[PDB]
Design an enzyme around this catalytic site. Structure first.
Site, mmCIF file in Angstrom:
data_model
loop_
_atom_site.group_PDB
_atom_site.id
_atom_site.type_symbol
_atom_site.label_atom_id
_atom_site.label_comp_id
_atom_site.label_asym_id
_atom_site.label_seq_id
_atom_site.Cartn_x
_atom_site.Cartn_y
_atom_site.Cartn_z
ATOM 1 N N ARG A 93 0.837 -1.200 0.000
ATOM 2 C CA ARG A 93 0.000 0.000 0.000
ATOM 3 C C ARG A 93 0.870 1.249 0.000
ATOM 4 O O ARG A 93 0.627 2.190 -0.766
ATOM 5 C CB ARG A 93 -0.958 0.014 1.192
ATOM 6 C CG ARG A 93 -1.575 1.407 1.392
ATOM 7 C CD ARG A 93 -2.906 1.402 2.125
ATOM 8 N NE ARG A 93 -2.932 0.538 3.300
ATOM 9 C CZ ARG A 93 -2.308 0.789 4.446
ATOM 10 N NH1 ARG A 93 -1.592 1.905 4.604
ATOM 11 N NH2 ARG A 93 -2.405 -0.083 5.440
ATOM 12 N N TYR B 5 -15.822 17.397 -15.954
ATOM 13 C CA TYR B 5 -16.265 16.017 -16.113
ATOM 14 C C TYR B 5 -17.330 15.650 -15.083
ATOM 15 O O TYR B 5 -17.228 16.009 -13.908
ATOM 16 C CB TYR B 5 -15.049 15.093 -15.985
ATOM 17 C CG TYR B 5 -15.356 13.621 -15.872
ATOM 18 C CD1 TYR B 5 -15.895 12.922 -16.943
ATOM 19 C CD2 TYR B 5 -15.073 12.920 -14.707
ATOM 20 C CE1 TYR B 5 -16.164 11.566 -16.851
ATOM 21 C CE2 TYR B 5 -15.344 11.565 -14.605
ATOM 22 C CZ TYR B 5 -15.890 10.899 -15.675
ATOM 23 O OH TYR B 5 -16.155 9.553 -15.568
ATOM 24 N N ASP C 193 -6.449 18.829 -15.052
ATOM 25 C CA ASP C 193 -6.822 17.505 -15.543
ATOM 26 C C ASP C 193 -6.431 17.472 -17.014
ATOM 27 O O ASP C 193 -7.094 18.076 -17.864
ATOM 28 C CB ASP C 193 -8.313 17.253 -15.323
ATOM 29 C CG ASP C 193 -8.742 15.845 -15.739
ATOM 30 O OD1 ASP C 193 -8.061 15.250 -16.596
ATOM 31 O OD2 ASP C 193 -9.761 15.346 -15.208
ATOM 32 N N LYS D 12 -8.019 6.311 -20.013
ATOM 33 C CA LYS D 12 -8.260 6.791 -21.371
ATOM 34 C C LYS D 12 -6.977 6.589 -22.203
ATOM 35 O O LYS D 12 -6.521 5.426 -22.335
ATOM 36 C CB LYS D 12 -8.736 8.255 -21.336
ATOM 37 C CG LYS D 12 -9.765 8.466 -20.211
ATOM 38 C CD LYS D 12 -11.047 7.643 -20.407
ATOM 39 C CE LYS D 12 -11.964 7.722 -19.160
ATOM 40 N NZ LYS D 12 -12.391 9.085 -18.858
HETATM 41 O O1 LIG Z 1 -22.020 13.117 -16.581
HETATM 42 C C1 LIG Z 1 -21.507 14.018 -17.276
HETATM 43 O O2 LIG Z 1 -20.417 13.850 -17.878
HETATM 44 C C2 LIG Z 1 -22.230 15.344 -17.378
HETATM 45 N N1 LIG Z 1 -21.828 16.229 -16.301
HETATM 46 C C3 LIG Z 1 -22.721 16.879 -15.558
HETATM 47 O O3 LIG Z 1 -23.799 16.404 -15.232
HETATM 48 C C4 LIG Z 1 -22.312 18.270 -15.130
HETATM 49 N N2 LIG Z 1 -23.465 19.100 -14.682
HETATM 50 C C5 LIG Z 1 -23.819 19.322 -13.367
HETATM 51 C C6 LIG Z 1 -24.931 20.150 -13.342
HETATM 52 C C7 LIG Z 1 -25.283 20.462 -14.705
HETATM 53 C C8 LIG Z 1 -26.270 21.222 -15.335
HETATM 54 C C9 LIG Z 1 -26.307 21.295 -16.729
HETATM 55 C C10 LIG Z 1 -25.352 20.611 -17.480
HETATM 56 BR BR1 LIG Z 1 -25.364 20.671 -19.360
HETATM 57 C C11 LIG Z 1 -24.387 19.879 -16.868
HETATM 58 C C12 LIG Z 1 -24.351 19.796 -15.494
#
Ligand SMILES: O=C(O)CNC(=O)Cn1ccc2ccc(Br)cc21
Ligand SMILES: O=C(O)CNC(=O)Cn1ccc2ccc(Br)cc21
Ligand SMILES: O=C(O)CNC(=O)Cn1ccc2ccc(Br)cc21
Ligand SMILES: O=C(O)CNC(=O)Cn1ccc2ccc(Br)cc21
Ligand SMILES: O=C(O)CNC(=O)Cn1ccc2ccc(Br)cc21
Ligand SMILES: O=C(O)CNC(=O)Cn1ccc2ccc(Br)cc21
Ligand SMILES: O=C(O)CNC(=O)Cn1ccc2ccc(Br)cc21
Ligand SMILES: O=C(O)CNC(=O)Cn1ccc2ccc(Br)cc21
Ligand code: NA
Ligand code: NA
Ligand code: NA
Ligand code: NA
Ligand code: NA
Ligand code: NA
Ligand code: NA
Ligand code: NA
Lengths: 380, 380, 380, 380
Positions: free
Chosen positions: B47, B99, B171, B196
């Site tokens: 670890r 993300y 990132d 990735k």
């Molecule tokens: O899962 C994924 O990669 C998408 N990421 C999300 O959900 C990010 N996110 C958080 C609130 C929010 C509102 C509108 C939009 Br457009 C995106 C938003």
């Protein structure tokens, strides 16, 4: 039916597709979808779920008589995921002598996030009752503890947690599911460093968690997916493989533990011996009521540091290394290796003397382990 | 000297002992000590450190021109370890479209620990300056972002962080160390989902972190050892192996990206195209000044949901699956797969239309990928 | 000292370099040379030698009290390498009921190369003496054999081979090095399908060979390097890991074998039982003089094909699959699975009746295995 | 369609069951049967067939435009299985300078089994016609050969074999399926040491065989099952993974080969250069007619032994080690390493001079490899 059969046929550890009698190793990160949102077998991204990891999770859920299992990249990652069930301002009660990594995580990481902790002597369960605050949300106990093998009453701890609305957690590493099943005694969550006995071969670092609570399982799955301390597929496979022999390994270890303790108690170079099988050990009756066997970790006092070092050098079959639960018998000196940063006078007050030796009994021949340790003690 | 040579000979990826030209896989949890406290080669418990993991950490430190590398069980475990540098009451600024896993971790896990977050439009760096609070301790940016490939000025972000005493984090998953090196531009910490492009073969879930800051490295090592989201040795090995071909894979991907974008821009069934190589893309100049190549992720609009689904079904060489950075070209529809829980009107406001398609360009023949996508678009 | 200790500490299965308590997995094909011809640790090309393979070879040499070990890609690859010690025109004597794969290799492959073979009843060792020709160069025996568990006198076979200048070979798969050590009884070469008990977990196909003869070892090393049927490093590692529990697994299997045989002998639906532990079994005394335990393979007669199939379907803990030496108890019907191409009348003449069932006892609880098989037999 | 696409989407390298985008690693020896003789997916025992091995076999069959693939534990195990198609008394014609392991296997192993061999100069195919005996059954050619890169006409060799009823075999290791496809030119069997370019990462020892002939495939399957030189599942997986980048790796290698040869031809410390791309090389036209690229192996003369050793020590990016087809550029001296047991005068007669250097070009930056080798040659 019986435990040794359950170790072989419990959980899902074959391939439904080909019939392979071992779990395939899904060294993969992602999965084809035939239509958007349609998963062939429920898999879409390996952080979220991986079939080899699902196999080891089914095994630990079966062996602990739970419903849901979770596999983490280490024992302390499992512990950290469980602590993350709480919020800033919540309080946890733990046993006073919790594993050093658990102590460090709680007091140097999670207190920075507003988690409050108290380490109390849980060998008397009314100590838990006194320590409960209006903000307490969790009770976390190891039994038996390291390195003095203190025993805590699991059933009474579960009852206290239920009455006061606490999440109860048992670190069941030292006993394994072969001998002690906290979920059967009312505990909410059981966890293991699978690095130790479950893997059993000193070749996987891993944590495992099991619960019967659907809501706690949902919360743990969300934490695992969001903070990502997941066990990989090769390590999951090696865990499934190691668990097959858990019963045979633990039973051999227990035969040796009994004979070794007899030898240590008789030997003039050994003073106090710490193990829950000893009838004068605190809460011996409690241990026997909540477990049907013993851990392989034993601690015992020799005279001083020089005697401990000489003991280590004189043995042929005890190996100086960190960790426990190997197929090899391991030997260590807590005051020099795990408790070294604690002031010497405080170590002594806590019973962690310069001459305190810890052994983790392996699966070598019982007579050899007894004779080897005895002849090494004879050189003192 | 040049990047393709550094990918082969950078880092320590041979065995000093036997001369093996690949890193041995140390499927082990613990290590013999010849005397108490004397480690043969610095290893004592996997670890804390494992030699195969040390190899991949040396690789990522070398490729990002840092001093210290860290390998975690997943990209989001790397992100979580970095966030744990902060305390309850500290504030983080992030780009608005971070993300989804990062958004979820921050807003559903770490806010429960008193970490405060704001998601702001970092394409204008003065937005960062306005968002700085007296409690801000960290600036965390992706560039380019997902799925609309927004570009943020790394050098200016580093300057702002330095002036205001913030830990700066990039990132760098989408660009990889082959094209963009944030530490060279003054950033404190760079991290990757090695799941990735770095692993490159869709067969490892892993995160990697690099820094040149000795004190931040000490803090990260403590967090990794205490919360235990470590990468295992088999996955570490597969990462080292995958990184060898990173340069060749990224260069093929880039040749295809350029030809595919030409095709998409010419095609009457395609509306807006999102990629930093397009000269009218916001901060195109900034991207070209901080990177010498391109990500393989492209997004583009077709008419509606039915058109997106038909596009997916009509292609021969684009594979419907989650993730990016495979050797296969992958295709997805964010509104249905990653952004589905967001209300439809808000998705539309954010540009995540029903017909928005994301492709992650793989290493297939360029002419095949262009022709396949074009003939599939012709069926619309 | 005692066997269970030798299984843990015999052979070289740690890393001298780091101290890792398990053998590193050298997933590598070639090795750096510091000067032309100077090998750092004796390795130059993995076909010739690989350090993980060297570890498992040291283990099998230690467990069989030999000097040299060899690891092959399968049991039949080990057998083929041993047969290749001979030339066109040389003759081999084998027991009459040798493993089907051995029979096939000898009569359909090696006879095309001018090797001559005779299969004789070695349960009377004077049958061997009669079968010796002027061209005989090798005596190859299994004991006990499959599926009727015929026993051959190893010590007398070795004496005959020595007197007549033959290479003596024992296939020791069924007994394992835990119970029977042919090299100690004068045999030149011992070999195993490590696919069975040694690996022990149904997850490696592998062969192992051991000898004390330096000249035979040199010849075998040349054959292995030239025809290349080598075991890979991952499989070598899994073999080393599986062998650790060989003693515990075999002892559990033996406890179950004894109780199962008692049950079978008492049961009215069972006729003849075949196992060397039965006192009326041919050469029972010979077996007890050359082994200190028993194989887990048992054969027994039920009435007919339909009864055998019903037995298989009625058990809960016996698994229908090929192979033996699993942690699972396995069940099969030789007349349908391994001996099916032999004419039915000849099968009957040889005792391979339609109702002959073979079980390979696993490590499930003894009471469960007895009760399960008994209740299944009660349905007949 | 085009080769780089076929490398990604050719063969079956996903999991039909879960959709995993990589081939699962079936670390297993045997398979459940639901009824005696009923195999769920055609698997019954891993020596006979294993699903991960089946994946790599499908890949090599697809890439060579064959119907059947076979994976062996090493290149020389593949060669040995192919030679075992013949009987005692049969004769084989091979090129004069065949790989040393092939020469050793044939002249020290298989001649003991009555196989007769002749090594003739196949650069003129009428040499083959003269060498045909009434007992000749096989023609086995490498092109280009090692270390002088002699080229043999594949199409004419196939025509000769067909006219005279010979099994034709091409060892296609040096060219790979990316550049040369012997089955398309009429050859019966193509084989590879997958240890070299196909695996590509110096971390698997393996052989691969492909054919379109159903009867030869049946015979090879029987030989593989009976003598058991099978590739294990982890190595099969790593081969499938390595082959994905074969096209990119070979194309980079070829760019470097062209520039390196220009440099070597211009350099005053270098005399003769051996590579089929050189227009004055014997059978250059034949090579270009049967291949659309080049091997990365180049040989060239420097003055003497001391110059060769100095060259090796002066390079920064050329690694002294056995084998070829790494991601690293490798360097060696045949007279000291592979041909050392041959008398010096005979070495000289054969062109294996003391100063003959062999390089296997890797995937480092082209300019770096050229400049490094040139500056090292400048020290002579
Ligand atoms: O899962 C994924 O990669 C998408 N990421 C999300 O959900 C990010 N996110 C958080 C609130 C929010 C509102 C509108 C939009 Br457009 C995106 C938003
Ligand atoms: O083993 C004990 O003494 C107690 N355990 C049980 O509750 C029995 N049990 C529960 C689930 C399960 C699965 C397979 C087998 Br086999 C046995 C099983
Ligand atoms: O590392 C390990 O396993 C040892 N664990 C600890 O350090 C636990 N711990 C924390 C404060 C403290 C004071 C005295 C003693 Br005694 C122990 C203490
Ligand atoms: O590659 C570039 O263009 C810039 N990178 C560099 O700063 C060169 N560089 C730094 C460390 C290092 C290790 C091996 C090799 Br080879 C080259 C290395
Ligand atoms: O075990 C038995 O009863 C007989 N075996 C022996 O001859 C003892 N023996 C031989 C080599 C060797 C290595 C380690 C250990 Br521990 C014991 C060893
Ligand atoms: O496949 C297996 O394990 C069975 N092995 C065999 O086929 C051995 N064998 C070869 C000829 C022959 C004739 C009668 C009998 Br009974 C057995 C015979
Ligand atoms: O690639 C070339 O130039 C020639 N090769 C071919 O004959 C095309 N071909 C044959 C099988 C096959 C499978 C997948 C893909 Br994609 C292409 C395939
Ligand atoms: O090991 C290697 O790769 C070298 N291969 C060989 O030894 C092939 N070989 C066999 C006899 C012989 C005579 C002269 C020369 Br030149 C080569 C010869
Ligand atoms: Na099961
Ligand atoms: Na409960
Ligand atoms: Na390096
Ligand atoms: Na800096
Ligand atoms: Na040892
Ligand atoms: Na002998
Ligand atoms: Na495919
Ligand atoms: Na043909």
């Amino acid at each position: 039916s019986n435990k040794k059969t359950k170790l072989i046929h419990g959980g899902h550890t074959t391939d439904d597709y080909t019939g392979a009698v071992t779990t395939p190793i899904y060294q993969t990160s992602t999965y084809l979808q035939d239509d958007i949102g349609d998963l062939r077998q429920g898999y879409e991204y390996s952080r979220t779920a991986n079939p080899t990891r699902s196999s080891v999770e089914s095994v630990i859920a079966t062996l602990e008589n739970g419903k849901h299992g979770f596999a983490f990249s280490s024992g302390v990652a499992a512990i950290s995921a469980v602590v993350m069930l709480l919020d800033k301002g919540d309080h946890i009660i733990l046993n006073s002598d919790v594993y050093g990594g658990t102590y460090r995580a709680l007091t140097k990481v999670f207190t920075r996030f507003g988690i409050e902790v108290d380490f109390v002597d849980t060998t008397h369960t009314d100590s838990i009752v006194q320590a409960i605050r209006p903000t307490t949300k969790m009770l976390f106990i190891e039994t038996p503890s390291n390195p003095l093998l203190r025993v805590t009453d699991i059933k009474k701890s579960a009852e206290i947690a239920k009455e006061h609305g606490l999440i109860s957690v048992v670190d069941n590493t030292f006993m394994t599911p072969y001998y002690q099943n906290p979920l059967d005694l009312g505990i909410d969550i059981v966890l293991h460093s699978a690095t130790k006995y479950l893997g059993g071969h000193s070749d996987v670092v891993a944590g495992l968690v099991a619960t019967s609570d659907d809501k706690l399982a949902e919360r743990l799955a969300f934490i695992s997916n969001s903070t990502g301390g997941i066990l990989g597929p090769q390590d999951s496979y090696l865990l499934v493989r190691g668990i097959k022999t858990l019963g045979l390994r633990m039973e051999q270890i227990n035969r040796s533990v009994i004979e070794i303790i007899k030898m240590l108690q008789a030997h003039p170079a050994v003073q106090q011996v710490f193990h829950p099988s000893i009838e004068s050990h605190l809460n011996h009756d409690v241990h026997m009521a909540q477990a049907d066997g013993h851990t392989g970790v034993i601690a015992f006092e020799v005279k001083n540091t020089e005697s401990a070092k000489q003991l280590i050098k004189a043995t042929s079959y005890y190996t100086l290394a960190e960790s426990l639960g190997a197929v090899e018998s391991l030997i260590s000196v807590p005051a020099l290796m795990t408790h070294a940063s604690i002031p010497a006078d405080i170590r002594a007050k806590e019973g962690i003397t310069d001459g305190l030796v810890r052994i983790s009994v392996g699966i070598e021949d019982t007579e050899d382990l007894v004779d080897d340790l005895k002849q090494a003690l004879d050189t003192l």
